[model samples]
Target: QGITFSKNDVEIIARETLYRGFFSLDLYRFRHRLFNGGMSGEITREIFERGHAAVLLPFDPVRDEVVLVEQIRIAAYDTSESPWLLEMVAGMIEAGETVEDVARREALEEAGLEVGRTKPILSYLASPGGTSERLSILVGEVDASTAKGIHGLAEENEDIRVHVVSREQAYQWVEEGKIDNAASVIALQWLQLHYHNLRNEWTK
Candidate 1:
């Protein structure tokens, strides 16, 4: 593909921080080169800076099972029937830490399972229209039978419950709309498509 655009295409008229607490909100007055070959008018937008994260799906191919975590998400309260969601082990990428590091750490902290070999599945922007947050998804080999009980950081007020289920059962939940989170849904779908190939590689 030819070079479509670059940083030189954007013109930042003004930028300011609107709020900074747990996360940051920045206001930007900028213009960019249009696809039809013209500059767009100065537009104002509020960007939410929540940072990037890593999501790990712990799977035990030998046992044909996977481990997931359940937690209450405040942001989903208004939109979802229930605020509690079933999701993969995930955590924000701390400074100086790689995505794989976050994946391994979150697996142990949220599900109390030590991840073995891991394979990257995909990376995506969570909500590119408003937020700068992105997430990297990985499938980590683990002993799902050993995952159970409640775990999380007390300081962060995290109350996470671990659930181990057959891979077929997880897919059934996806069909029934029980596992609706983006990262988990994507990871499960990826497993559905590539589990056999992944198992062969991991076992070798």
Candidate 2:
């Protein structure tokens, strides 16, 4: 039960790099097969080539709490009252690194905390229409009481503050729209629905 078209149905007429800074931008001139059994004209579009990343939400079942990080996001400065956003520990997946390795490393760099046991939550395309970035989410068990303070890599110009709050409180923030990021919002909502079973699994 798959779609009528696959990669084979799309014809790549031309591909060119538009920009290559920290991230990349590319232009693709391609066409796809129409449902009526015909090929469409050549279409051109630019795609943002930001790499994929991993996101980890640290939770402590014994305390019914979770650890989050707050950092300034320049992209949101224009629309948001404050640029600082509360989100799960996240970092871009570098070359020669596994998703689990990224989750653990980001947990340490962004929050100065260690992850004990981790379980994969989900994988999603952050914005498939424009960007080629896929994100993997994981829930990691941690000692929430010890997860606090300012932590980040100075070299990367990161200024992160760790916040430890009860699970309900985090959900409350989501309801209030305070937690607005897609990955964090999805992770928290997922936790809301599955926390009971996850708590049991983690505590045991």
Candidate 3:
């Protein structure tokens, strides 16, 4: 690989809070080194900050099933056929909470499910250009039959519906565009690639 710029190459001039609601926004003013040699001119960018999140893909190796949750997403409104989309159990990481902690808590809160044997799948920036949100995805063992009915916190006005489907069916939904969100799609695709070995190991 060729040489590339690092965080050391960037110089921050100022950071200012723009707004705070359910989410917070901040403006960053900075400059970075040019490819040839000199420093570039000042540039300003607004970063959407909502902390980080963890996504859990619950699966039953013995039963060959997966657990997914359905909920209304505002971001999908006016951009899709329906706002009620199928997604994985996910929650924001609060202060001092580990990614696994969030994953376990969200599984119980959003899907009435508990993860038995958990494994880290991957971590990535949810949206690098506009947001500072990182999504850490995990796959966990769960008895899909027991994960059903509505969950989520009533105080948060959340109405999450749990759906337990065969692993093949869920993968088919991904292929058919029934599941279109970032975290779910990535986790499901990862499952498809690793399922055979995962199933064998988990079953053992």
Candidate 4:
């Protein structure tokens, strides 16, 4: 079990800096106290609301392929020697849109694939112990024959390249540690287990 903390109040401590892209560095000060859980002592944990993000997996069973996007990732530099990354399609859900909407839109914008049927795979706190990042993942059927090459919103500074790889290559990359994003890895694993059923449905 975990200690229970009750937030009594919160106040902004400082405004660090504002970036040009409508984003800002913010800091908040809060008053919270830990209460004993039944007979256990209470511990107060500082909770911060950072932001939200979404990730999607595009499946093309007709082609026996999985669509992935490749782009220059600044974060990848810190994680590995290779800065550019091969990853699943992902985007942030806008103010008034559902996760499903974001997934479908990202598929078109990032991979040039318009998904037909989207099936929920899973949702989880991406990293609860560290940050306030949550993710929703799904599998959608798309026509991969027409999806390949660069396709992203040029206005958004998105230079994304779509890659349609065979199911064999997908599993190989997972085995070789090429496909490392958590959401993508999870979705692919699910597909690997249910690929037969997916192929039947896609052909039908």
For each candidate, the alpha-carbon lDDT, in order, equals: 0.93, 0.93, 0.92, 0.76
Ranking by lDDT: 2, 1, 3, 4
Model 1 over residues 1-204: C-alpha lDDT tens digits? 998999999999998999999999999899999999999999999999989999998999888899989999998899899999999999999899999999999888899999899989999998888988999999999988889999999789999999999999998899899999999999999999999998888777
What's the ranking of the predictions by TM-score, best on top? 3, 2, 1, 4
Angstrom error of the Cα, residue 71, model 1: value is 0.8
Using alpha carbons, what is the TM-score of model 1?
Answer: 0.95
Candidate 1 accuracy as lDDT = 0.93
Model 3 Cα lDDT, one tens digit per residue, 18-94: 99999999999999999899998999999999989988999999898999999999889998999999999998899
Per-prediction TM-score:
0.95, 0.96, 0.96, 0.78
Q: Number of backbone collisions per candidate, in order?
A: 0, 0, 0, 0
- Relative to the unseen true structure, what is the C-alpha lDDT of residue 78 in candidate 2, on a scale of 0 to 100? 92
User: What's the true lDDT of residue 197 in model 2?
Assistant: 98
Over 1-204, each residue of candidate 4 has an lDDT whose tens digit, in order, gives 774544332333443332324543333333333243232233333434446666778888788888889888887788886877788888887799888889988988898888888887888787675445678887888877888889889998889988889978997898788988777788888888888988897678
- Quote model 4's TM-score: 0.78
Badly placed stretches (over 4 Å) of model 4 are 1-50
> What local lDDT score does residue 109 receive in model 1, on the 0 to 100 scale?
88
Residue 103, candidate 2: C-alpha displacement in angstroms: 0.5
lDDT of 1 at 117: 92
Off by over 4 Å in 1: 1-3
